[PDB]
Design an enzyme around this catalytic site. Sequence first.
Site, PDB file in Angstrom:
ATOM      1  N   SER A  61      32.409  31.825  44.651  1.00 45.77           N
ATOM      2  CA  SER A  61      32.951  31.050  45.787  1.00 45.77           C
ATOM      3  C   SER A  61      32.968  29.533  45.518  1.00 45.77           C
ATOM      4  O   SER A  61      32.458  29.079  44.493  1.00 45.77           O
ATOM      5  CB  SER A  61      32.202  31.383  47.091  1.00 45.77           C
ATOM      6  N   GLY A 110      35.114  25.482  47.114  1.00 46.51           N
ATOM      7  CA  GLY A 110      36.244  24.874  47.839  1.00 46.51           C
ATOM      8  C   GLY A 110      36.329  25.475  49.232  1.00 46.51           C
ATOM      9  O   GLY A 110      35.575  25.094  50.129  1.00 46.51           O
ATOM     10  N   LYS A 168      41.819  36.106  43.351  1.00 49.21           N
ATOM     11  CA  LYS A 168      41.268  34.898  43.965  1.00 49.21           C
ATOM     12  C   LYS A 168      42.006  34.629  45.264  1.00 49.21           C
ATOM     13  O   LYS A 168      43.225  34.672  45.322  1.00 49.21           O
ATOM     14  CB  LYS A 168      41.371  33.725  43.028  1.00 49.21           C
ATOM     15  N   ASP A 227      37.516  17.652  32.019  1.00 53.98           N
ATOM     16  CA  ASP A 227      36.320  18.094  32.710  1.00 53.98           C
ATOM     17  C   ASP A 227      35.948  19.504  32.266  1.00 53.98           C
ATOM     18  O   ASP A 227      35.650  20.365  33.089  1.00 53.98           O
ATOM     19  CB  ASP A 227      36.537  18.051  34.231  1.00 53.98           C
TER      20      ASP A 227
HETATM   21  C1  LIG Z   1      33.276  40.241  36.804  1.00 55.41           C
HETATM   22  C2  LIG Z   1      32.785  38.965  36.574  1.00 55.41           C
HETATM   23  C3  LIG Z   1      31.444  38.737  36.802  1.00 55.41           C
HETATM   24  C4  LIG Z   1      30.885  37.488  36.600  1.00 55.41           C
HETATM   25  N1  LIG Z   1      29.571  37.335  36.819  1.00 55.41           N
HETATM   26  C5  LIG Z   1      28.642  38.273  36.163  1.00 55.41           C
HETATM   27  C6  LIG Z   1      27.245  37.886  36.640  1.00 55.41           C
HETATM   28  O1  LIG Z   1      27.033  36.486  36.337  1.00 55.41           O
HETATM   29  C7  LIG Z   1      27.764  35.610  37.191  1.00 55.41           C
HETATM   30  C8  LIG Z   1      29.057  36.261  37.702  1.00 55.41           C
HETATM   31  C9  LIG Z   1      31.684  36.427  36.163  1.00 55.41           C
HETATM   32  C10 LIG Z   1      33.036  36.635  35.936  1.00 55.41           C
HETATM   33  C11 LIG Z   1      33.603  37.910  36.131  1.00 55.41           C
HETATM   34  N2  LIG Z   1      34.930  38.196  35.910  1.00 55.41           N
HETATM   35  C12 LIG Z   1      35.838  37.305  36.305  1.00 55.41           C
HETATM   36  N3  LIG Z   1      35.296  36.241  36.845  1.00 55.41           N
HETATM   37  C13 LIG Z   1      36.006  35.239  37.302  1.00 55.41           C
HETATM   38  N4  LIG Z   1      35.180  34.287  37.761  1.00 55.41           N
HETATM   39  C14 LIG Z   1      35.410  33.101  38.499  1.00 55.41           C
HETATM   40  C15 LIG Z   1      34.617  33.190  39.841  1.00 55.41           C
HETATM   41  C16 LIG Z   1      33.153  32.710  39.865  1.00 55.41           C
HETATM   42  C17 LIG Z   1      32.689  31.857  38.648  1.00 55.41           C
HETATM   43  C18 LIG Z   1      33.468  32.125  37.353  1.00 55.41           C
HETATM   44  C19 LIG Z   1      34.883  31.895  37.729  1.00 55.41           C
HETATM   45  C20 LIG Z   1      37.355  35.283  37.225  1.00 55.41           C
HETATM   46  N5  LIG Z   1      38.327  34.465  37.573  1.00 55.41           N
HETATM   47  C21 LIG Z   1      39.506  35.065  37.250  1.00 55.41           C
HETATM   48  N6  LIG Z   1      39.275  36.252  36.690  1.00 55.41           N
HETATM   49  C22 LIG Z   1      37.941  36.396  36.684  1.00 55.41           C
HETATM   50  N7  LIG Z   1      37.186  37.417  36.216  1.00 55.41           N
END
Ligand SMILES: Cc1cc(N2CCOCC2)ccc1Nc1nc(NC2CCCCC2)c2[nH]cnc2n1
Length: 261
Positions: A18, A20, A38, A132
């Site tokens: 999460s 913004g 998203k 950044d």
């Molecule tokens: C399934 C998954 C789990 C995590 N985590 C695993 C546990 O550690 C933190 C979150 C991170 C990214 C993803 N996959 C995954 N994450 C995204 N994350 C965004 C949202 C929160 C921080 C990282 C940016 C994605 N944005 C587009 N496609 C994505 N796909």
Amino acid sequence: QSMSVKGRIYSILKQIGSGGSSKVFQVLNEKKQIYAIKYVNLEEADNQTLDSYRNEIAYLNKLQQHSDKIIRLYDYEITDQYIYMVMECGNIDLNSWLKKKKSIDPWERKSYWKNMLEAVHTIHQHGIVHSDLKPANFLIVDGMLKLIDFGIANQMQPDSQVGTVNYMPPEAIKDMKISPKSDVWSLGCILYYMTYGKTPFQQIINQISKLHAIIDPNHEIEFPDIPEKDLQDVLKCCLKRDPKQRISIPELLAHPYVQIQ
Ligand SMILES: Cc1cc(N2CCOCC2)ccc1Nc1nc(NC2CCCCC2)c2[nH]cnc2n1
């Protein structure tokens, strides 16, 4: 639960993050394929904000073709209330993956660098300097790194924070100019962390003595010795405090470190 994007329906599996005023969810479609959607809530978005988002959305849409080190955007729905983006799903972002890691297979590392270098080069070919870059901008997907964002009034966090300021280059600080060499300093810092387990100024708690150090040449950065002399060189070459002295992305691509063996 559930949701709808351009007619098609997706069931929610969990929230990922999460910030913004936007959540990212993991989700399943009608064919039981997994995706990341998203959601952005526009109810408090000024016109500037809104144009910045239409702007990244367009750049992401465009740069999809040009590299697979950019995150796939499959679809989207955009209205005055909200945006939905259907994206390819990562396994984990790089900040989190590096937090819970004891040490790095020097192969995995060289391979990630290759990915980072390709992705960042790509946005530079299309006029974009990120300025950044942090590990959080990178997402791991089939053993590959893919770049997630480019530059907006943009902010994310799983459920570290932002501002951080350990990947910030000297010139971004003296600004109170910015150019492609700015993305080399940040990429260097990331590689330094993947190399020495910390960022070059990480051990300077006081946020202000940190900013002072970054811009101060008499403050020298320590580059402890290592089996991969090349890796030591790349780092010394990315972390030049004067942009004009700093190596470039096309040079880094031709460098022994990513090329030899
Ligand atoms: C399934 C998954 C789990 C995590 N985590 C695993 C546990 O550690 C933190 C979150 C991170 C990214 C993803 N996959 C995954 N994450 C995204 N994350 C965004 C949202 C929160 C921080 C990282 C940016 C994605 N944005 C587009 N496609 C994505 N796909």
